[PDB]
Design a protein around this ligand. Structure first.
Ligand code: SF4
Ligand code: SF4
Ligand code: SF4
Ligand code: SF4
Ligand code: NI
Ligand code: NI
Lengths: 170, 763, 393
């Protein structure tokens, strides 16, 4: 529940540097203190529970959503600002400080990751964290090493409880 | 000799201009696999944060070098395959056999485009292989410590390795098709049965794994000569199966060999116990085959110098002695490099081994499955070690109650790598458990796939040119690559069906063709029998193994030749520019894992053909993506007067990875748009792209108006409302009394305009 | 609309398993027709059904079917009726559960059960067809339909349909070059062949066999500034070789200097260019001074020893080469068929299937004179064959 740091096991490692295992309080503070955050959402949010949790999180702090993959149909009726973008493209665009963004107001400084695959988001973050200065917070089930801060390894119920506790502190 | 282009027999310096021109728009994006370099003993060096190692090479240079090494490895495995096959063919049939491919003015578009030569006999392919080797060697010399330092010349050398790979594939395919009696541009190739449920356990079963077909031809020659076709089953895994099913099949008669599956099936088949002997040649063969065959008493025979497998070399021994030794359990297999003796030993070994090993398999029984399922503790290691991220603990927990549906679902997604079993402290054969849970699906696993047709003839391309121009064929979709799929082997089938229903041209090859042919509709028909096998709209054609992928690319080259009269000889830059600016054709490797797929994708990119890869391909460490928001990136020259011309942002990538098959469908539909399309082609492409976007992403695309230059560039069914959307949301001025666009588009329509990326082709 | 409209439904086939009715068909009486009327003889957005409607039908039963469209506007003329009829087929296949086959009077219509349950009346289907026609051809600003369903009414319209079809055929056959003011230019293939310009006249059909003089007329009417346009002939520079000044300056303007002259009905004197899409290719035989024709569908060799692909690979790309010519099949039925070289009096070879297909074109006396591959397998054989039968060459 509250504990999202007791499991940071990995199968293979990218190198010495790894993301910090944070708690729900730290994650909520980091999300609520960002100057210009972007909610990068994969198709794993199509799970109904994760869907409404992500919608509530985006509504709470007015965070634009980048629905990578085929997760756009889960945001058509919800009153949020979600736009489609390829994750490999988005990761390429993030490293360019001259990219106007999804609304033309400039680049972002902090991204939030929820509902991806640990072998694809890690590959994108490999470029993002090495050729840019954008910080990443992973609120997903898996421990993402290539992020800046991430949750630990949690089960489905544990992940739902952690997301709830974040939403209450948002 | 005829007119020769500016670039015959290219080197690293000779193709640098075209590669840099391409990289100006489609910039390389590096996604490193590590933060360390482990090449020389100065290291391993940490390069995190784009830091440089002890040799001065930075992280970007290391990622580029790793991708370049992958590309040259793939190019070296088609070239070695091609050389070995060509040498065997010349030794058997002689080196003066005329090349027999079909009915086309240009026989070898890749060879003529790169080297400038016009081969006519099997002995004229020998020099091309010498060049393909020589340059290859130079390329490998760049992997050394202290060689190229910049990360852009590594990309240029990668593109050179890609085009060399395509040349080698073309050479190999031409040699084998000419010699071994493959179908010659046949739009009615025979249908062959595929699936694990096709092999019959009653008869002895031989399983051939690899890519080369030199020894398998001898095996099937012996089987036919001695009349054992009906008394023995022969099956193939990977592309060697396609090579058998094309062998002596220009008579359009159904064959007796059967395709078992892709690489992901290999271990599963071994765990089934159906094979009675496994003969391996070379590429794509699991390294733990003897380690299981010794448990299940399955002999392993190697037939290549590349893959000997640490086995005794009995090339000079008698076949009866080897059979006795294998029968008595002295050795689990042997290296038999003599093709004549191998072709007799393998069927005889199967015949003498089948009765002594019938009924032995690794599949657990009901009580054994119950015990194994009850043994688990749900520690989560198997899910961590699974490459496909499969919920194994949840499936096992559901199976504890008696709900074996979760493992049945997991069977399709699993690639049969057994990596989970090595991290289970309870020692549970998870792969065997999943196979037993999906026994029924495995039993009912059958399908039909059309045999390799060879290369596309000139007449079919000429017939389809009018369809492409008159806006009846939206574009060309190639579905190639490996079988490292993220969500099972059905995504390729779904994409192919979706694009075939919309009258695209679908060309398949490799393991993707096998996995497309494994699924049927309600009427019990596969796509191959649902759609014709010609090169036209609404047709799906199979070229064969990966060495036939060149034909796909080669077809594009002929589009530049037979339609615009362009010279092919040594003119890579011109033909590539034509293909990039005019031909709407996209490739798709949904499960690419091997270096061959990387080399094929890079070679396709250097020819101007964009490709979409599976999510796992993000581990290749390089993509080619354009900056759509940068309006200065999309500017070309006008060949009529040398003026500056504007083009719509399409294609927006050369290599990129999709995440789901719906996003892949949307991307493939979008990136078939070209600046040279007329009104009808643009209209049909926009219609299909917008419909697919609405179907799968649920919204209308945000940049569609970038491709609307004319009122006749809009879908017929949704023209007026799209005009209203253009007027209200953007301020375009529309003639509502004539349904015409008065003003607003940035790019005017001029069908006579000739966009080009090369300054030297203007005026 | 109750059903979706999209070209992706073109390949759908309504099998009898899901078929609800089979209108017209290959057994009963079926018809399609487009008529041109003045502006005061047409009421827009009108669908009239005579006899049973879709409600008064039986699942599995076949009923007589006759669609008659009254189209009208300002630029609409009777000669442009057939062009409209040609699209009917396509615009029926855009609908979801509707299947259309053949044309004229051999038509075949089928509706699926799923779409029958959605579109209760024949009215929305007709409205969708009309909107597709109006969007495709803007110059048609008034359209209405009549759907005849009884056998009596279908038989009543059948005679008028046959009479007007005969009249249309007579008209299109009688039209020639001197009885037209404009020659219609097409550059659609310039997407793939940057220097290819096509000129279409009543006596010179398009090399792809898809655009007639009337097709080009309608296309130029829709978009005068598009890839299809109208050019005035101007001075008659050569009647024998179909050379006009207008075509000359149009080629000079739109060919980027690749060629400054197009000579219609000529082979060795500034021949018409062709991109890649010939239904037929003509080649020279200089030993017999003859002309051979090979279609795209031929799978055999020629007396020259060359197939279709090898020969067609030496003509095209927009380059005005001499020695080969890409033509459509309907060019054989033209009285000005290569009239600058002798017409049929120079043809010495055709494949058997091509000869059977275009036998109507060859004159009766020369029908035996022309040699096929059923008798000639060489070039010496062709020489002896032309020697025995006394070919005009
Ligand atoms: S090649 Fe360069 S970066 Fe790699 S280990 Fe050697 S010195 Fe370090
Ligand atoms: S590794 Fe073995 S014990 Fe652990 S969860 Fe997986 S199957 Fe169960
Ligand atoms: S064998 Fe199958 S379930 Fe086990 S790790 Fe490999 S892919 Fe995953
Ligand atoms: S061949 Fe036909 S479609 Fe092509 S330009 Fe000529 S008339 Fe137009
Ligand atoms: Ni053409
Ligand atoms: Ni053409």
């Amino acid at each position: 529940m509250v504990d999202t740091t007791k499991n940071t096991k990995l199968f293979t490692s990218y190198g010495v540097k790894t993301s910090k295992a944070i708690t729900t309080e730290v994650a909520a503070k980091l999300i609520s203190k960002a100057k210009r955050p972007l909610f990068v959402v994969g198709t794993g949010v199509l799970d109904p529970e994760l869907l409404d949790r992500a919608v509530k999180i985006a509504k709470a702090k007015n965070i634009p959503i980048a629905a990578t993959g085929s997760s756009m149909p889960g945001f058509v009726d919800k009153d949020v600002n979600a736009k489609y973008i390829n994750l490999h493209q988005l990761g390429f665009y993030l490293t360019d400080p001259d990219w106007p963004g999804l609304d033309g107001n400039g680049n972002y400084d902090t991204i939030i990751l929820l509902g991806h695959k640990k072998y694809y988001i890690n590959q994108v973050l490999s470029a993002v964290k090495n050729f840019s200065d954008v910080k990443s917070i992973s609120i997903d089930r898996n421990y993402i090493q290539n992020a800046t801060m991430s949750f630990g390894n949690l089960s489905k119920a544990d992940h739902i409880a952690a997301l709830d506790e974040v939403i209450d502190l948002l | 000799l005829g007119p020769m282009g500016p670039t015959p027999f290219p080197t690293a310096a000779t193709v640098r201009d075209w590669s840099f021109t391409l990289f100006d728009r489609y910039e390389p994006v590096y996604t490193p696999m590590c933060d360390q370099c482990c090449y020389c003993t100065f290291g391993p060096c940490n390069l995190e944060g784009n830091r440089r190692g002890a040799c001065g090479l930075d992280m970007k240079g290391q990622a580029a070098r790793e991708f370049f090494l992958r590309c040259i490895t793939g190019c070296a495995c088609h070239s070695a395959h091609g050389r070995h096959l060509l040498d065997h063919i010349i030794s058997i049939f002689g080196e003066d056999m005329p090349i027999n491919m079909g009915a086309s003015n240009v026989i070898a578009p890749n060879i003529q485009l790169i080297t400038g030569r016009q081969p006519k006999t099997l002995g004229d392919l020998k020099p091309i292989m010498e060049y393909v080797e020589e340059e290859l060697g130079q390329l490998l010399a760049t992997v050394h410590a202290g060689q190229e330092g910049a990360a852009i010349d590594y990309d240029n050398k990668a593109m050179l390795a890609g085009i060399l790979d395509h040349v080698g594939m073309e050479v190999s395919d031409i040699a084998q098709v000419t010699a071994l009696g493959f179908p010659k541009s046949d739009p009615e190739a025979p249908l062959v049965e595929v699936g694990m449920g096709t092999l019959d356990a009653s008869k002895p079963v031989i399983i051939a794994i690899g890519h080369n077909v030199a020894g398998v031809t001898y095996i099937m020659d012996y089987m036919e000569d001695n009349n054992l076709t009906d008394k023995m089953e022969i099956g193939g895994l990977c592309c060697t199966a396609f090579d058998m099913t094309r062998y002596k099949r220009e008579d359009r008669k159904p064959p007796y060999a059967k395709i078992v599956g892709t690489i992901s099936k290999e271990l599963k088949v071994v765990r089934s116990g159906i094979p009675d002997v496994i003969v391996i040649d070379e590429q794509c063969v699991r390294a733990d085959l003897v380690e299981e065959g010794k448990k299940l008493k399955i002999p392993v025979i190697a037939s290549n110098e590349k893959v000997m497998y640490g086995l005794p070399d009995r090339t000079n021994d008698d076949v009866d002695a080897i059979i006795e030794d294998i029968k008595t359990g002295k050795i689990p297999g042997c290296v038999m490099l003599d093709y004549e003796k191998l072709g007799e030993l393998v069927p005889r070994l199967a015949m003498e081994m089948a009765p002594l090993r019938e009924g032995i398999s690794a599949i657990p029984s009901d009580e054994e499955m119950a015990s194994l399922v009850a043994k688990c503790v749900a520690c989560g290691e198997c899910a961590l070690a699974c490459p496909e991220e499969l919920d194994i603990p949840d499936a096992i927990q559901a199976a504890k109650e008696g709900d074996f549906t979760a493992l049945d679902f997991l069977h399709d997604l699993c690639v049969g790598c057994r990596r989970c079993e090595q991290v289970c402290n309870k020692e549970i054969p998870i792969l065997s458990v999943i196979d037993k849970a999906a026994q029924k699906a495995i039993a009912e696993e059958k399908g039909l796939v059309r045999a390799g047709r060879g290369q596309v003839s000139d007449a079919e391309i000429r017939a389809e040119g009018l369809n492409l121009v008159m806006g009846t064929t939206p574009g060309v979709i190639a579905i190639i690559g490996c079988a490292n799929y993220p969500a099972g082997s059905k995504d390729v089938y779904r994409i192919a069906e979706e694009f075939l229903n919309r009258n695209y041209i679908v060309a398949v090859s490799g393991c993707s063709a096998m996995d497309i042919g494994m699924y049927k509709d309600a009427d019990g028909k596969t796509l191959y029998e649902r759609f014709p096998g010609r090169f036209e709209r609404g047709n799906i054609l199979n070229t064969g193994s990966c060495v036939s992928n060149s034909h796909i690319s080669g077809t594009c080259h002929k589009v530049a030749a037979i339609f615009a009269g362009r010279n092919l000889s040594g003119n890579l830059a011109e033909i590539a520019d034509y293909t990039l600016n005019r031909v709407g054709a996209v490739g798709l490797a949904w499960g690419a894992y091997s270096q061959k797929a990387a080399a094929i994708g890079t070679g396709c990119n250097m020819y101007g053909i964009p490709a979409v890869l599976g999510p796992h391909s993000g581990k290749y460490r390089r993509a080619l993506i354009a900056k759509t928001y940068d309006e200065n990136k999309w500017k070309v020259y006008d060949s009529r007067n040398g003026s500056e011309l504007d083009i719509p942002p399409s294609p927006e990538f050369l290599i990129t990875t999709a995440e789901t098959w719906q996003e892949a469908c949307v991307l493939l539909a979008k990136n078939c748009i070209r600046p040279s399309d007329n009104n009808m082609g643009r209209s049909i492409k926009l219609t299909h792209w917008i419909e697919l976007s609405e179907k799968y992403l649920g919204v209308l695309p945000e940049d569609w108006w970038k491709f609307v230059r004319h009122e006749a560039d809009l879908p017929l069914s949704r023209r007026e409302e799209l005009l209203k959307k253009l007027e209200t949301e953007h301020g375009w001025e529309i003639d509502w009394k004539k349904k015409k666009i008065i003003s607003g588009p940035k790019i005017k329509f001029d069908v006579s305009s000739q966009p080009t990326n090369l300054k030297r082709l203007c005026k | 609309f109750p059903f979706e409209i999209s070209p992706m439904f073109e390949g759908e086939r309504v099998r009898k398993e899901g078929m609800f009715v089979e209108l017209g068909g290959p057994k009963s009486l079926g018809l399609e027709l487009v008529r041109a009327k003045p502006m005061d003889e047409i009421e827009d957005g009108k669908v009239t059904i005579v006899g049973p409607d879709l409600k008064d039908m039986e699942e599995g039963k076949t009923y007589p079917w006759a669609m008659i469209f009254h189209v009208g506007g300002e630029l609409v003329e009777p000669d442009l009726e057939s062009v409209i009829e040609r699209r009917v087929h396509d615009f029926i296949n855009y609908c979801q559960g509707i299947m259309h086959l053949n044309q004229r009077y051999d038509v075949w219509m089928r509706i699926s059960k799923d779409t029958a349950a959605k579109m209760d009346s024949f009215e929305p289907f007709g409205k969708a067809v009309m909107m597709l026609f109006k969007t495709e051809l803007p110059f048609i600003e008034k359209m209405q339909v009549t759907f005849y369903t009884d056998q009596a009414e279908v038989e009543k319209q059948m005679a008028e349909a046959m009479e007007i079809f005969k009249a249309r055929d007579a008209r299109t056959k009688d039209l020639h070059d001197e009885d037209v003011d404009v020659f219609y230019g097409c550059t659609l293939c310039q997407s793939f062949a940057p220097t290819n310009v096509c000129v279409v006249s009543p006596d010179r059909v398009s090399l792809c066999g898809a655009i007639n003089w009337f097709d080009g007329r309608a296309a130029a009417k829709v978009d005068p500034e598009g890839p299809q346009f109208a050019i005035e002939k101007g001075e008659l520079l050569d009647a024998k070789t179909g050379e006009y000044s207008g075509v000359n300056e149009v080629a000079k303007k739109l060919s980027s200097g690749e060629f400054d002259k197009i000579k219609l009905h000529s082979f060795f004197d500034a021949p018409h260019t062709s991109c890649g899409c010939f239904e037929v290719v003509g080649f020279y035989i200089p030993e017999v001074d003859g002309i051979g024709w090979v279609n795209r569908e031929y799978q055999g060799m020629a007396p020259n020893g060359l197939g279709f692909s090898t020969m067609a690979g030496q003509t095209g790309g927009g380059k005005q080469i001499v020695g080969f010519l890409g033509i459509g099949i309907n060019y054989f039925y033209s009285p000005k068929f290569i009239q600058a070289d002798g017409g049929w009096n120079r043809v010495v070879w055709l494949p058997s299937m091509l000869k059977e297909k275009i036998d109507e074109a060859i004159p009766d006396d020369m029908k035996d004179k022309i040699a096929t591959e059923k008798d000639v397998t060489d070039i010496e054989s062709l020489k002896t064959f032309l020697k025995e039968k006394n070919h005009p060459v």
